[PDB]
């Protein structure tokens, strides 16, 4: 059960960025974002995930203010966690 503030499917930014809470049901391969092979990309290893926001598998994403993403999700703004 997703948190009340989870990013959902008719969120306009989620649609534009092709977010899915489950990276295995994402188009990460098509996008081929740089930094890691696409099959290795998900929110946990993304620069925009906020480790101090949320709880458990439901964490912040800087791009979705006031909401939570799933650590096992993906979107097209995936960028390697570099610092
Ligand atoms: S920007 Fe990164 S952390 Fe935020 S939803 Fe997209 S992949 Fe997940």
From Swiss-Prot:
Domain of life assignment: Bacteria
The keyword Lipoprotein is annotated on this UniProt entry: no
Alphabetized GO MF terms: 4 iron, 4 sulfur cluster binding; electron transfer activity; metal ion binding
Subunit structure: Homodimer.
Primary role: Specific class of high-redox-potential 4Fe-4S ferredoxins. Functions in anaerobic electron transport in most purple and in some other photosynthetic bacteria and in at least one genus (Paracoccus) of halophilic, denitrifying bacteria.
Keywords on record: 4Fe-4S, Electron transport, Iron, Iron-sulfur, Metal-binding, Transport
UniProt family annotation: Belongs to the high-potential iron-sulfur protein (HiPIP) family.
Residues bound to [4Fe-4S] cluster: 43, 46, 61, 75
SUPFAM superfamilies: HIPIP (high potential iron protein)
InterPro entries on file: High_potential_FeS_prot (IPR000170), HIPIP_sf (IPR036369)
Pfam families in the record: HIPIP
Keyword flag Protein transport: no
GO biological process entries: aerobic electron transport chain
PROSITE patterns in the cross-refs: HIPIP
The protein, known as: High-potential iron-sulfur protein
Temperature dependence: Thermostable.
